Amino acid sequence: SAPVVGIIMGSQSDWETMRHADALLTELEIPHETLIVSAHRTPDRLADYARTAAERGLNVIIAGAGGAAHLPGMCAAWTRLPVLGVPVESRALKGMDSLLSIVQMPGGVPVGTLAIGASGAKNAALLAASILALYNPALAARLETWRALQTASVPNSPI
Amino acid sequence: SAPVVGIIMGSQSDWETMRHADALLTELEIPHETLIVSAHRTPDRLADYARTAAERGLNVIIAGAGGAAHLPGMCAAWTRLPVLGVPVESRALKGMDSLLSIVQMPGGVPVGTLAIGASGAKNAALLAASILALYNPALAARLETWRALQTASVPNSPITE
Amino acid sequence: SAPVVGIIMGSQSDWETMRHADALLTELEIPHETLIVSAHRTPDRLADYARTAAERGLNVIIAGAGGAAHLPGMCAAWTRLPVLGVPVESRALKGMDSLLSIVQMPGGVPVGTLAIGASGAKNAALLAASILALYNPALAARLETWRALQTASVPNSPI
Amino acid sequence: SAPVVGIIMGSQSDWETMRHADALLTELEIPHETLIVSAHRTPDRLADYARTAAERGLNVIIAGAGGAAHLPGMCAAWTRLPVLGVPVESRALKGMDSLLSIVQMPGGVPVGTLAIGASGAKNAALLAASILALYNPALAARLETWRALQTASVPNSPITE
Amino acid sequence: SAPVVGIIMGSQSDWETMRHADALLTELEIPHETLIVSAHRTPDRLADYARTAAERGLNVIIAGAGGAAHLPGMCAAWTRLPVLGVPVESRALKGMDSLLSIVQMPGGVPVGTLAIGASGAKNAALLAASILALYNPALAARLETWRALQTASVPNSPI
Amino acid sequence: SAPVVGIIMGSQSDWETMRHADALLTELEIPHETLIVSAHRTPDRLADYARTAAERGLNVIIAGAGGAAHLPGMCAAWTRLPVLGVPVESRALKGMDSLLSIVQMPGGVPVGTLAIGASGAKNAALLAASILALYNPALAARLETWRALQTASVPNSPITE
Amino acid sequence: SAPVVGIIMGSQSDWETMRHADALLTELEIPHETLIVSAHRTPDRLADYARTAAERGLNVIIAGAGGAAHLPGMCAAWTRLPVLGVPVESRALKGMDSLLSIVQMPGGVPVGTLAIGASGAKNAALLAASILALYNPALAARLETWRALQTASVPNSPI
Amino acid sequence: SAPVVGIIMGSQSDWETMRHADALLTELEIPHETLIVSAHRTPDRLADYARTAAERGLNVIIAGAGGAAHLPGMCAAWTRLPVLGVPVESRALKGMDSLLSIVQMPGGVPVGTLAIGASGAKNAALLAASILALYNPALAARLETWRALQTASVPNSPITE
């Protein structure tokens, strides 16, 4: 029941994208919390969140942000937990700024980065699931089923 | 002694970059194997490697490749294990082709991507470590100590010559 | 009657683009098959498809995909047949990711890459036709007629 | 002895890159000619070359150029033969201008484009070979052997020094 | 009455953009011809057009094309006349391909390149006008008036 | 003697670039401090530095970082003072990642960004100077003289060898 | 009452973006002027504006422009005052041209550059406010309140 | 002896690139002047230069600059004469900032832009020559001869070593 995955985003505007991560986790029945934490507007909230993540039982953190996206990186700076970053598509630069701002982390503080947009949010949840599956037999079976269904469901020819 | 992390790369040329992941896993005392698997030259070897990774005891796979870098993505297509990708810097496009070829995975098959080059290789090992640390108290302690030292080792001012 | 060209795409979403390749081949009366084969979701389906392409009589394979587009490259990895790649336009990066993921193949395994989008799908079919025309006199004549009509039909001034 | 593949480039400076296509065709025993044809400096030479390629017995044309690379595209405009383009790496933009100038052909006139630089030149020859192999059993056998060797020649692990 | 400026574009699709060049020339009463000449689809038409431009009385050629834009460059290859290139905005890459394909001409064969899109078409006409103005006193006065009106008409504050 | 401008950078490697800001502030006689503050390795040090900057008497902060450059932005998140950011040139992407990571701040938390590299570092110091000059007549006079000299020092023609 | 901040833009088309800077300054009760000054169409107007800015009492200049954006740079060339540049989003290149044209100023003449678009216009106003706050106690308090409200208003979870 | 073409650049560092335009104009016997005019450091010098260019007898202006290259555009804002711009290659962004800063002029004030670097400088001179040739039969003849020689000087095949 207690969340093992924390999904955080810089603002309501990121929800359209991050909701895909939320749906995936719920789908696979992975207890998680979905919150808004702004690196730029609520820096202390971020520090406290990341710093106490481990103590609270969280195992993985999924963070999404766009533009000069610092949320994932700074979160990773305050936690020993794996941090997965989702580059939210920005209006002007289409998430290229979001991508470089998140993926180009200097050695020492990692952020496992996913694709720009919805695909990245969904994949961050799947990656978080594959991580949790390493020590959760039941979830591992559900993930196997999920991947198996994805594969089996692909049509043989276009409509 | 059994490897829990697999480091794979498309060729010997990728070693200059991937050696950084290898060194860090060793530093943190994480058993691992290092192999060359070419997505384009040995596609069947890749299929078999990724398909059997879980049963062989591997928990995480770190894959590096440059240019049209398909090694990480295709590995992830065959394994349920988390796959971390390292974009190897390419000559002409400086790893931008490597980066986009790895990070832009469509929804459904993830690849946790790290920075272009050496920094990415090191961080891939560190991310793999933080993943394994979730269920290995001893490692969690070594990682905590490693991160704590990194923080304490940062100088307060630059050597202004 | 048996297909000599195989058009494959990663998903239904690629059809809007790849249909242009299908139309062109049909137009020139080139027997072909149009299928969905996902490099990421159906890797074994891809391996089997590419590996047996030659045996089945296929002469050229046209593969389309977007984002981290691996379909053309991996297909080329399992076949000695010419593989033509079509970069499908992606939402965020407009097919720049698709393009680099397909064209930047390391030496040893080629993929003849065409333009991003519809133009690329149409040109992949035309390129496949020019290849088949080298050993098919009748088709060669039809291709000549096609190119001749394209040239002759260009208006002299805009409307 | 009659050439079945034509390798053309805009200038001597392109040879450092295009020599890789030449060497591979020779390796696979594919008769070919290597010439310099400048789309901008010798437009009429280009027109004549492309226009008569088919009647001269050529089956495939490999064209290389950098910067505002128009050689492949314009060649394709004059021949019904398949034209493969090699983006030669440029100084400032690292072949990105070369790449876009070649691959982005509007629908109606194709150019099978390969990677920027040496890898693209080699692959252009290999693609040309796979095209010719469709109707040349002997060549098909040599190509199969070449690809098989490439696969078997890949090391299983890197030389970790 | 005889055209002194030739506006050429690869296809009808370029008209939306090139019409701005046509309007400007007409505005300044510069005799010109507006035609469709495809470098890829009508290469011989292009060769003949460019090769005979000077003989026909043309002084400047304005050429527009998108994607792998070769029209301006090839036109410049067959004429000693100044060739101005207009990068037409392409669907996927927004004219970045058009721009690089036109501006990056190797030394020896120039193409004076303008901005991507409508602005470039309009500026190509203005640049052509400034060239013609060097030997046409009347036109020079009209261009001066045009530039003077542009400057004087700029508002002092936004609405 | 009390510093009114703070120059901070993520590591010693940034000094080669940031030294230009330091030298210019000294040239204009602007008291300042130069420190290393890592946004990723010493996040708490950054929080404290930025939070207390105003009370410590600082008026402007010049922050430099490369790659995923978060130092300027995060500093601005904790201080009401104007923060100027210098994109340090990165190896692979030539500072483009540094630039976008700094300049693209969402509305609400600004960072006055300067050019990639040395020019940006120098201009950050000059911008800081023009800010301080608004309420320091003496400095305003030195800046005016500096700008006037720059203008008068420009040669009228190049040395054509 | 006399303006201490000058907001200038190249044309009416920039207003959609620059209005955000105007709103912010008004919000914080910072006396300012909002004008249209074109670097390319009204160069002398720009020279005079920038050259006399200081004398007129202006403390900071916020300049916005798109495409080959020269307004901020040239303004900075004629004034000792701090110049903040706002890259207006351009149609084709989405403000990447605007950004590079403004931020890449050579050493000697600075331009504090903000994000492309609305965010940049808003941040330029905030940056100008943080500068003025250094010598205006009352404004400093209002800015503190503004930043405090921004931080406190961020929701804890998405809707 | 009176100059009909003016070559201007922002600094001595631009000369390495702009010298190519100078040499070509001399080769074609086109009288010209070469000066340094900084758009940012000597804005008033630029205003005066561009404003009086026409009355001084200049017919074409070739302007080169790198980075945030505003010299060509601002020159065009003050003169009715055609202005040709040469993007000087920049260190970090390889002239891409130079290119966009010059070519992307909004409708109303043109700048005929050439390629990044030396090739652009040479072509700017050649374009200027083709402009002047429209009303100078002697020059038109020299240009025709120059272009004809360029075409005839292209080798038929590469020196394959």
UniProtKB/TrEMBL annotation, chains B, D, F, H:
This protein's pathway reads: Purine metabolism; IMP biosynthesis via de novo pathway; 5-amino-1-(5-phospho-D-ribosyl)imidazole-4-carboxylate from 5-amino-1-(5-phospho-D-ribosyl)imidazole (N5-CAIR route): step 2/2
Q: Name one GO biological process term.
A: 'de novo' IMP biosynthetic process
Can you give the residue ranges of the PurE domain?
Answer: 3-154
Q: Does the keyword Amino-acid biosynthesis apply?
A: no
Reaction(s) catalysed by this chain, per the record, are: 5-carboxyamino-1-(5-phospho-D-ribosyl)imidazole + H(+) = 5-amino-1-(5-phospho-D-ribosyl)imidazole-4-carboxylate
Q: What is its EC number?
A: 5.4.99.18
Q: Answer yes or no on keyword Zinc.
A: no
One example of the protein's molecular function in GO is:
5-(carboxyamino)imidazole ribonucleotide mutase activity
Q: Which PANTHER family match?
A: PHOSPHORIBOSYLAMINOIMIDAZOLE CARBOXYLASE, PHOSPHORIBOSYLAMINOIMIDAZOLE CARBOXYLASE CATALYTIC SUBUNIT
According to its UniProt record, which protein family does this protein belong to? Belongs to the AIR carboxylase family. Class I subfamily.
User: What does this gene product do?
Assistant: Catalyzes the conversion of N5-carboxyaminoimidazole ribonucleotide (N5-CAIR) to 4-carboxy-5-aminoimidazole ribonucleotide (CAIR).
Q: What protein name does the entry list?
A: N5-carboxyaminoimidazole ribonucleotide mutase
Species assigned in the record: Acetobacter aceti
